[PDB]
Design a protein around this ligand. Structure first.
Ligand SMILES: [Mn+2]
Ligand SMILES: [Mn+2]
Ligand SMILES: [Mn+2]
Length: 195
């Protein structure tokens, strides 16, 4: 059995881009197949168990979709933790504004679960990835500039470290910026090694 195909089981353009770039030396074929599930149905308090339940639910949906259009499938789920609050994608500009403003002069975590499955098998491997990003102080003006670009709406906690203004206020990251953005290749490399 020679596996040459990766099923990219996410709608994230960034994730798809990194996967093709980093894993094109191993895989010939990259198939886009987003899970498109109702994530609101899953509600665990622990963000590690939360993201894991969602990544596994996403994998189930992807493998089902694969049956009707040898391979490995990958899914992901990621949330932000700020203080005691678990944050997903913001529901409005107002909440996003609030989210971004709160990152000034402090630390913010991301918690994720990556899942991997060889299509046709029953074992779904999972791995967690956690980051912590530390910002210097910034004011309402920088908040509005980031908001105006709109990409923040599509990230957990409205956290966009790649944003022109946000980037200028990052002091350090424990982890990698690719991890904060939702796809650290080292995590996928570790899961592949566990086959
Ligand atoms: Mn765990
Ligand atoms: Mn999610
Ligand atoms: Mn999603």
């Amino acid at each position: 059995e020679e596996i040459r195909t990766m099923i990219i089981g996410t709608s994230s353009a960034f994730r798809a881009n990194v996967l093709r770039e980093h894993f094109g030396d191993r895989f010939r074929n990259f198939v886009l197949l987003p899970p498109d599930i109702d994530e609101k149905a899953y509600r665990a308090a622990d963000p590690f168990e939360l993201t894991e339940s969602i990544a596994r639910a996403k994998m189930k949906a992807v493998l089902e979709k694969a049956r009707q259009h040898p391979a490995i499938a990958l899914t992901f789920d990621q949330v932000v933790v700020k203080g005691d609050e678990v944050r997903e994608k913001p529901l409005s500009t107002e909440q996003c504004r609030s989210f971004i403003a709160s990152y000034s002069g402090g630390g913010v975590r991301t918690v994720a679960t990556y899942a991997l499955c060889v299509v046709g098998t029953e074992n779904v491997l999972v791995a967690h990835n956690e980051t912590e990003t530390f910002f210097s102080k910034f004011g309402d003006d920088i908040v509005e500039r980031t908001l105006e670009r709109g990409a923040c709406m599509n990230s957990a906690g409205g956290l966009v470290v790649e944003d022109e203004d946000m980037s200028r206020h990052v002091v350090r990251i424990v982890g990698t910026s690719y991890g904060v953005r939702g796809m650290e290749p080292a995590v996928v490399e570790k899961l592949l090694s566990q086959l």
